Structure formats: C-alpha cells, structure tokens
A paper describes a structure:
Serpins are proteins distributed among all kingdoms of life that act mostly as Serine protease inhibitors, but also as inhibitors of other classes of proteases, although some that lack inhibitory activity can serve as chaperones or storage proteins. Serpins from parasites are interesting immunodiagnostic targets, due to their presence at the parasite-host interface, where they are crucial for the adaptation and survival of the parasite to the host environment by modulating inflammatory response. Among these, SmSPI is able to weakly inhibit chymotrypsin and is expressed mostly in the parasite’s head gland, confirming its localization in the parasite-host interface, thus its potential as a diagnostic target.
In this context, we present the 3.22 Å resolution crystal structure of the S. mansoni circulating antigen SmSPI together with flanking immune sera recognition tests using sera from affected patients. One protein molecule was found in the crystal asymmetric unit, with an estimated solvent content of 67 % (Matthew’s coefficient = 3.78 Å3/Da). Electron density was well defined for the main chain atoms except for some flexible, loop regions. Three SmSPI epitopes were identified: Ep1: 123-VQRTHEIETSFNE-135; Ep2: 175-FMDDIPDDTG-185; Ep3: 320-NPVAANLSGITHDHQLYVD-338. All three identified epitopes are clustered together in the same region of the protein. SmSPI showed to be able to bind human IgG in sera from people affected by Schistosomiasis, while the response of the protein to healthy serum resulted to be significantly lower (p < 0.001).
Numbering used by the authors: 21 to 34, 37 to 106, 109 to 261, 264 to 356, 369 to 403
Write the structure that this text describes.
Amino acid sequence: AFTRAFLSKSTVEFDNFLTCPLGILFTLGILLGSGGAQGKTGHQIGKAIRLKSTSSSWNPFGAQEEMKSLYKELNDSLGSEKTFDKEEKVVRISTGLFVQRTHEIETSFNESIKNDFKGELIPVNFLNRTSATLSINRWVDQQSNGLLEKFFMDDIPDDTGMILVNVFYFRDFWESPFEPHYTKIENFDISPNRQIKVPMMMKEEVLHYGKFENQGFEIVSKPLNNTRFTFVVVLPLWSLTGAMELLNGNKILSEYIKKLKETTVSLRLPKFTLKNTLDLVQTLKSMGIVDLFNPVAANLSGITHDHQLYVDKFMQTNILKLNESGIEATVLPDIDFNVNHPFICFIYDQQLTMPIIAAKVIEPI
C-alpha cells in the first residue's frame, strides 16, 4: 500500500530517523484532489496512493473526486479525536504550497484547497530568496505553535519551481502516566564504544506484550489517553536489522500488533524528544512519482496555465517529545522491558490500523 511503499524508500536513507507517512499522503492528496496535477504527472500520484480509479486507466475527473472524499474521510476522523481541562485537537496537520506570487492561479484550484482541504496556499517571491526563506520559517513557526521554530531552508528554486511543507503534530496524555519520582538517570548502550546517560522512566503495569524470538524484536504497546492510538516500542534481543523489517514495510505492524497479549511489565523508557526535518523528493521518485519534481516534464496546469512549474522541494518536519505525562503534554511484573539500546517506535492507529508515525531512535535526544 502507500504507507508500506514510503517507509521502504524512506528508511533506506540511513542515525535518528523520524517520518509520518500519514500526512505525506495528505500533502499529495491536495495535489490530485483539488485538480492541480493533471496528465502523466498526477496519474503517477494516484497510482502511488494505490487508489481505485488509477488501477485501470487515466481518467482525470474520476481520480479527483475519489481522492477528495478519501482525504475528507480520513481528515474528519483524526479531527473527530479530541483530548484535554479544555478539549483540544489530538492530531494536527498543516500543509503549505508556497508559490511565486505573480502566477494567476486558477480560481478552481484556489477554491478547492480552502473549502475542500484544510491546507493553505502561500504566494511569495523567490527572487527575494532572503525574504523568501523567513516567510516559510514564520509560516512553520506559526503552525507548530513555537515547537518548530528555527526551520531554515538552505536552498530555494529559480522562480518556476514550488516548495511544499507538511507539519504533523501529535499531542496526547498517557492513559497511565509515569511517576517522576522514579525517573532516574541511566546508561544507554548506543554501541560497544559510546554510552550516554538519559532520564529513564520506570513504571510497572499491564500492557500488551509480544516476544518474537522468531525475528528478534520484542514488542510493547502503551495506549494513550485517547485509546484509539497506542505507542509501540520495538526492541531487538542488538541484532537491530531484525526489527527494521517492520520499519521498511516488509512486515505489517498490525500483523504483529495482533499477537500482543495482556501482560505485567517492568517498563523503563527513556525521556527524549525527536525532531527531524526531511526531504521526500528523492523518496517519492523511487516510489513512483518522478514527473512532479522535474521542470521539463511536470504538469501542474491545474494551478496555473501561464507559466510551467514543478515541485522543487517536498519538506516534512516533525516533533516527538515524550515525558512522564504523555506525548507533548506537560502490580507484580512478569516481563522486564528495559530500553537502553537503540530501538524502533511507532504511534500506531488502532482504528485505521496504520503507523501514522514511524521512528528509529539510535541515540535519545
């Protein structure tokens, strides 16, 4: 499927990885759905999303409406999820199309991104590359409510090309938070040679466990306050590559989630924060979208019909900060589950059954 294709060509890029293939879809749903990407260009997108209408033949009108409802379907769902003592959105997704101001955008394309998607068109001047970058930095700093300030893009396109940015943010409490009285400082076996300290978080409770001496990666799942989403940690029994097979899409996660039984667990978990800016232009080509990031052969006539443009940079930026209290929020055990060497964690969806956020941690920040 899509999420299983993305993690394939995204994880081969590695060191501390952090990606959210959930919203990257959203970034690109806003290309097909609105009607921006026509021809070969947008067809290659529908195909990579593996949707019905692209299965048989190019049919422009058709794949727009099916992406528009597919997006809108998943989009109110992650929005229908509200957590606290004032109700707050649990999932947070902004998606930004930064474009040369001079271009007469089609009023249909502009009508759709506003009333059809939750996303935002930003008209800026790339000639003023200096003033151009800060516009982006102010945009992302305004969307992440300060969590992701200091995002500075090293290079800018020469007038025709575009820049997309996607900011996923997942905020929630634990279902059973950690006592800070027991968050002590402990070693973390990075390698034989380097070992660092970190604030380990010790709690014992009933959590769904799973050992797989089959592959070599034991599994734990801690649910958040909103029980639909679970936080999953994958520990090797230091094999390391045995776990990644889950991370690059060779192994379905749910497939493994399903064998997790109620257990008592002595959980010791590092306090850490993961932030990780990524470019998906060399990823979305190897995954079958190569006619979009190319100036000669990109067809974004749905946006403008006076000057030809393409996508220069497809940027993503994420923040995962774990605390005793939850994620971004401030009993006799039968299983020990100490996490002091590198691991692979997920924010798993229990309804959509997909890992919205899949991360590989080498050294905890």
